[PDB]
Amino acid sequence: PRRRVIGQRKILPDPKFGSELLAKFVNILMVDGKKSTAESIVYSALETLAQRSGKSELEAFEVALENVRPTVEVKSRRVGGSTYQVPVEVRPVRRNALAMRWIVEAARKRGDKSMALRLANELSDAAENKGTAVKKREDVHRMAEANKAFAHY
Amino acid sequence: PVIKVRENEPFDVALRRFKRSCEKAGVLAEVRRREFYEKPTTERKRAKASAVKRHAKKLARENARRTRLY
Amino acid sequence: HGGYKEIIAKISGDGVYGRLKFESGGHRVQRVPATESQGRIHTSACTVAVMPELPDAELPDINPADLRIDTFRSSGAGGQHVNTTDSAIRITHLPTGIVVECQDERSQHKNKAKALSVLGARIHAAEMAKRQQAEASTRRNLLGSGDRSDRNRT
Amino acid sequence: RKQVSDGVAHIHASFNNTIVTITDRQGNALGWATAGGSGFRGSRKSTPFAAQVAAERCADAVKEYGIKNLEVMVKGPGPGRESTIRALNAAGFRITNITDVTPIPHNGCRPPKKRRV
RNA sequence: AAGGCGGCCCCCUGGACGAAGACUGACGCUCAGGUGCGAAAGCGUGGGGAGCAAACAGGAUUAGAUACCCUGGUAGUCCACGCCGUAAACGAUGUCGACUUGGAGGUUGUGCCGGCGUGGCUUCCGGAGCUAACGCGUUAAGUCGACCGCCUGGGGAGUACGGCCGCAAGGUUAAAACUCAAAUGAAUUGACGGGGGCCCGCACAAGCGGUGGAGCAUGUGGUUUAAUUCGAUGCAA
RNA sequence: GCCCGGAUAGCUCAGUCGGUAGAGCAGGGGAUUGAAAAUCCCCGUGUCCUUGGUUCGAUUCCGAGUCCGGGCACCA
RNA sequence: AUAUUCUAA
RNA sequence: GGCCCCUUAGCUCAGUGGUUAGAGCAGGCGACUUAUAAUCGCUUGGUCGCUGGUUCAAGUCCAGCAGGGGCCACCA
Ligand SMILES: [Mg+2]
Ligand SMILES: [Mg+2]
Ligand SMILES: [Mg+2]
Ligand SMILES: [Mg+2]
Ligand SMILES: [Mg+2]
Ligand SMILES: [Mg+2]
Ligand SMILES: [Mg+2]
Ligand SMILES: [Mg+2]
Ligand SMILES: [Mg+2]
Ligand SMILES: [Mg+2]
Ligand SMILES: [Mg+2]
Ligand SMILES: [Mg+2]
Ligand SMILES: [Mg+2]
Ligand SMILES: [Mg+2]
Ligand SMILES: [Mg+2]
Ligand SMILES: [Mg+2]
Ligand SMILES: [Mg+2]
Ligand SMILES: [Mg+2]
Ligand SMILES: [Mg+2]
Ligand SMILES: [Mg+2]
Ligand SMILES: [Mg+2]
């Protein structure tokens, strides 16, 4: 907004693993304020990823996030007359948001039967560096390398 | 402008000192002036305009020390 | 912004020109238009012309008994042949008074053929000119000016 | 082929393009790279970055000569004239001296008419 | 003098200004007609031609684009001589003389002892007064005198016709009919600007979920009808 | 009078040489706009000039006409 | 870079 | 009669090399825009005009064909 008074809203840590990061993920996955439904889908998908990794559910999530997290994105800002698309370093909070949001968007457009599986599959494909998630990080990295020339300081 | 780098001198310094040497000689401003022909009439009009602004800045310096705002 | 600058429609039936003949002339309209920003009343007019269907236009046959055909020696080059030969045709159409001369070819038959063709074209063009003038004048009178002052109906 | 050791780096900076040309003291060209030929057209071609990337490619085109020290000559008033030197330095060369040789007339030929944009 | 005049050097040459004197003795001021000078473009003849650039050509842009932008490019721009005689040729302010508080500079002389006077030219502010107002204000648009030029509603028209001038382009002098009830100057309040500055609102941006496609509900337009009762119609039906 | 070319969407035109037709501009419906252009999205559009043949089948290949344009109608 | 127009009470 | 050059993705194009690939405009979706433009990112897709052989893996290396053009040749 025009003022700049945004007191970062107080968010509860999730019950099972006690992680605000994963509590956020649930929120991003959640639909029609049906969190119960969402939490079940996340724990199921993290339990599955626990088996197909041999690691902690949080640690298996961290590994996935890391290969999704973009470092520099494109933002359109005017300098003179022309409207150029300019690379901006992404803030660490927005690094996770995008990541989590990209994964869920990626894991909502697969053929597999249950969302819990679709999520587990994409969170796994992320860990390897294959999934549509970790295909649109590249895209949002390389489009932020073409316009590298517009990074005036 | 011609900067010779001296013994035991870092580069970043010798570059800032080159930048300054060109800005002092007014090279970039000189070439921007020579880019397009300004009609003499236009050259006189902007010389006049500048002097009027330089002079009006003097009269816009008194009404500040003499007059109070709060 | 809609409507028509002009709309010409044939209305076909039994007793049309007996009921629409009186629509001819100026129609004055007084209202707040659709093209008006300030809600002002404006006074516009439209001209309506209702002209009855004139029996098409039968281009008639060129009756040879209504022609005077003159044959004579052609003018200019062509040695002994052009000196001695009645090549040249003047066809005078007695009704209209239109006269066409033709001596473009060396043969009287070609000339006469060409002249009948032209005399046809010129007779048929002259009567289609009358019809246009008659129609133009008839319309001119029905319409009147498009001015708000010249109206049969408000 | 033939070692030269001490050479000159000419930097033709225009509003549109940047042309780096690394020569010897006698002014015989060894290698050159342009911002326009370095994967940059239009807007992106007239930026200090593309003039940086160009400088690099010119350094990476005269290593076979083994230039150790450069005299730099900057020309014209474009974004190329600053960052091209930073690149040459950061590419490993030793900048002996930096000279501006931008041609200034002493009131000579009539420039072209002013653009009405 | 105006138009104008800008590297450096020489040659020829005009004016201005200051200082002290000496000299002439109203020899002055203004000026219809007249004469001369007079930017740029343009014209003639002969040169010249780097750069620039009417015309022109192509490329773009665009609804079109005989433009603006781009690539070229001829006259021209340069020289000699001749012509043209006009410019918002403006200070939109005729020339000459006198008089009428101040302040701050610039520039160029000069007298006296880093100070104190006195001239010339010139920039900016401002007092009285003047002015419709804006402004001008000892360089007057103040206070006066001399002489000249010029104006008399807006269009038509600085045009026609005639004359004079010119190679031409054109210049100069200069009407009438007809037509309108205005045209105009300055300033004031707004509104507006693809003017400037500063702010705000889910206005954008950041997000999330919709509508626009499907079927149905419902209102409307239209069309239909004996009747499809009347009203609401951008946002704000 | 003869000869060559042409006849294809509402207009100007491609196309095909035996099977199954396009373009641009119009046109319609939507969007954008206070509204009209410009612009954007969705659509539709042909007896392929008329006949009489050949052919399983003709816009296409014959042979007639019709309309349009372009020649020519001469040596003397 | 591109933004034309708005009769007449 | 000889030589040759090239005829690869919708439209095109380009070419080493032991292979059917590299694009650039198009065509799809993304970003961008006040909206168009341009911009950028992502993808999309050849019997290398065909056809033989020959090659550890040959459209090429080498034949037999088709295809067009460019210059030269051509005294039943
Ligand atoms: Mg230019
Ligand atoms: Mg006089
Ligand atoms: Mg001149
Ligand atoms: Mg001349
Ligand atoms: Mg000459
Ligand atoms: Mg030009
Ligand atoms: Mg005058
Ligand atoms: Mg002047
Ligand atoms: Mg002046
Ligand atoms: Mg005057
Ligand atoms: Mg005088
Ligand atoms: Mg004053
Ligand atoms: Mg005159
Ligand atoms: Mg006269
Ligand atoms: Mg938004
Ligand atoms: Mg619907
Ligand atoms: Mg109703
Ligand atoms: Mg109503
Ligand atoms: Mg009522
Ligand atoms: Mg009402
Ligand atoms: Mg109009």
PDB file of C-alpha atoms (C1' of nucleotides) and ligand atoms in Angstrom, chain E residues 40-42 77-78, ligand 3:
ATOM      1  C1'   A E  40      18.026  34.647 -44.299  1.00  0.00           C
ATOM      2  C1'   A E  41      15.993  32.686 -48.343  1.00  0.00           C
ATOM      3  C1'   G E  42      15.940  33.688 -53.594  1.00  0.00           C
ATOM      4  C1'   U E  77      24.841  26.841 -47.786  1.00  0.00           C
ATOM      5  C1'   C E  78      31.225  28.877 -49.408  1.00  0.00           C
TER       6        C E  78
HETATM    7 MG    MG I   3      22.455  34.403 -48.770  1.00  0.00          MG
END
